[PDB]
Enzyme design. Structure first.
Site, PDB file in Angstrom:
ATOM      1  CB  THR B   1      93.513  34.070  21.302  1.00 32.75           C
ATOM      2  OG1 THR B   1      92.325  34.722  20.805  1.00 32.75           O
ATOM      3  CG2 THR B   1      93.764  34.526  22.772  1.00 32.75           C
ATOM      4  CD  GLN B   2      98.011  31.714  15.982  1.00 35.54           C
ATOM      5  OE1 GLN B   2      97.090  31.813  15.185  1.00 35.54           O
ATOM      6  NE2 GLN B   2      99.064  30.942  15.756  1.00 35.54           N
ATOM      7  CG  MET B 107      91.231  40.262  17.944  1.00 35.48           C
ATOM      8  SD  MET B 107      92.628  41.287  18.332  1.00 35.48           S
ATOM      9  CE  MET B 107      93.165  40.462  19.889  1.00 35.48           C
ATOM     10  CG  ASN B 108      93.074  32.866  14.749  1.00 34.45           C
ATOM     11  OD1 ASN B 108      92.260  31.981  14.492  1.00 34.45           O
ATOM     12  ND2 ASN B 108      94.351  32.605  15.001  1.00 34.45           N
ATOM     13  N   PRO B 109      95.940  35.914  14.387  1.00 35.41           N
ATOM     14  CG  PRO B 109      97.934  36.362  15.491  1.00 35.41           C
ATOM     15  CD  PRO B 109      96.463  36.169  15.744  1.00 35.41           C
TER      16      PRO B 109
END
Lengths: 233, 233
Positions: B1-2, B107-109
């Site tokens: 989530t960035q 979900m944290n690419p």
């Protein structure tokens, strides 16, 4: 003496021995015989399978770990399963995560590290099986010998199990010869069979009795059993 | 989530008859502020691979670290670390691919687009891309960001399909690469003039050039433009 210091793997004897590990090594010497020997192009495994009655199967002693690696077992089969399964997983991981065939040398290093945990940890138990590992990779053919103590050694050939010493000496002389069997699979196998016959006493190696495996340059780790080993007696 | 913060723009590359070339500028933008002017974004891994990265710099820097560690740990108990069991471009790529898809799936690419260019042990050129979503693909030419839009059309006029690779020379290729780079400086508001280029040839090995500049610029024609239509002077 012994009876006091052999209760577990977390106890050193006053000599600096680990009896549980030592006792583990004994189940190997109790097992049937198997031999490994490599040239510069192939690595073969010949192992004598052992039945329980004349009414039973001959315990399978060789396991394919990857298309490029495999091993013959001597001792406690379950422990063999547990270990080969681990070898299967590490081979899988290298392919998947790096698209790299696992180095036998590394496979060796990994097996040693796994066994060692059951030789310094409470309530645990050393593995009771020795393993002959062969494989072809980016640096040619290989043969590795694994012992529950955690010791792994790469050799031109060797043998383990009951009477192993026969073949082990045989190869020790036959070296200069077999190591030069390049490009001729059947011969190395033969050399293997001869070697295996050096640790016999029971009866002559037969169809239900023999188990051979070969890996090499343009040869994927393939298991030959019974009907197909006929030409090698 | 960035959400990326400091970023780097395109990375362009193409493969030729005996190697591959790749380039990227030396800018770390902070939105519309061209903030950092000395950022190498081409990462040499060993002697046969360069990995160019665009996207969030902090994540790139993290991938730098992951790459050094990958090297350190391959040397370990590896007698052949500087030879037969050295890191191949494909190994490095599949590793990175794997990480990208795992970070996206969590979900944290790692907010990047990466091209791994290099040549394999057996001489084959290697050029492939993977990005924040784990999407991967390969082509005779490859570029990220604006380079995909502008550079690819150019670089492809030289190598339109596989068969053209053996007919293309380093000189041709490098020329192309530098032009594309120039183009991008003209039309990409986030490009910089300073850049880094690297060639990985199956003979000369890895050549890495630092401090190149876009030259031969056509700006003279700007003088004959006045107004936006009806204005005379």
């Amino acid at each position: 003496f012994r009876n006091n210091y052999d209760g577990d793997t977390v106890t050193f004897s006053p000599t600096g021995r680990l009896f549980q590990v030592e006792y583990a090594l004994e189940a190997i010497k109790q097992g049937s015989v198997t031999v490994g020997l490599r040239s510069n192009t192939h690595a073969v495994l010949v192992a004598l399978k052992r039945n329980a009655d004349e009414l039973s199967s001959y315990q399978k002693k060789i396991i394919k770990c990857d298309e490029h690696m495999g091993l013959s077992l001597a001792g406690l089969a379950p422990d063999a399963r547990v270990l080969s399964n681990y070898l299967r997983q590490q081979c899988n991981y290298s392919s998947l995560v790096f698209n790299r065939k696992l180095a036998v040398e590394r496979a060796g290093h990994l097996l040693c590290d796994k066994a060692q945990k059951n030789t310094q940890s409470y309530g645990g138990r050393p593995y009771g099986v020795g393993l002959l590992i062969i494989g072809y990779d980016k640096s040619g053919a290989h043969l590795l010998e694994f012992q529950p103590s955690g010791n792994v050694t790469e050799l031109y050939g060797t043998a383990i199990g009951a009477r192993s010493q026969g073949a082990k000496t045989y190869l020790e002389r036959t070296l200069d010869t077999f190591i030069k069997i390049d490009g001729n699979p059947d011969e190395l196998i033969k050399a293997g069979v001869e070697a295996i016959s050096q640790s016999l006493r029971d009866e002559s190696l037969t169809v239900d009795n023999l188990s051979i495996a070969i890996v090499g340059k343009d040869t994927p780790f393939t298991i030959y059993d019974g009907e197909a080993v006929a030409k090698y007696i | 989530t960035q959400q990326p913060i400091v970023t780097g723009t395109s990375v362009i590359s193409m493969k030729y008859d005996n190697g591959v070339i790749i380039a990227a500028d030396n800018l770390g933008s902070y939105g519309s502020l061209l903030r950092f002017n000395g950022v190498e974004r081409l990462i040499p891994v060993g002697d046969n691979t360069v990995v160019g990265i665009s996207g969030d710099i902090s994540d790139m820097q993290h991938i730098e670290r992951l790459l050094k560690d990958l090297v350190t740990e391959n040397a370990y108990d590896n007698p052949l670390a500087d030879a037969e069991e050295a890191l191949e471009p494909s190994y490095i790529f599949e590793y990175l691919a794997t990480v990208m898809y795992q970070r996206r799936s969590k979900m944290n690419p790692l907010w990047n687009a990466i091209i791994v260019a290099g040549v394999q042990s057996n001489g084959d050129q290697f050029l492939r891309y993977v990005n924040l979503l784990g999407v991967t693909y390969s082509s005779p030419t490859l570029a990220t960001g604006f380079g995909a839009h502008m550079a690819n059309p150019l670089l492809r006029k030289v190598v339109d399909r596989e068969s053209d690779i053996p007919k293309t020379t380093v000189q041709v290729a490098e020329e192309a690469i530098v032009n594309a780079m120039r183009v991008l400086y003209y039309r990409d508001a986030r490009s910089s003039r300073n850049f880094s280029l690297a060639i990985i040839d199956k003979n000369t090995g890895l050549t890495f050039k630092k401090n190149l500049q876009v030259e031969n610029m056509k700006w003279d024609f700007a003088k004959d433009i006045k107004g936006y239509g009806t204005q005379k002077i």
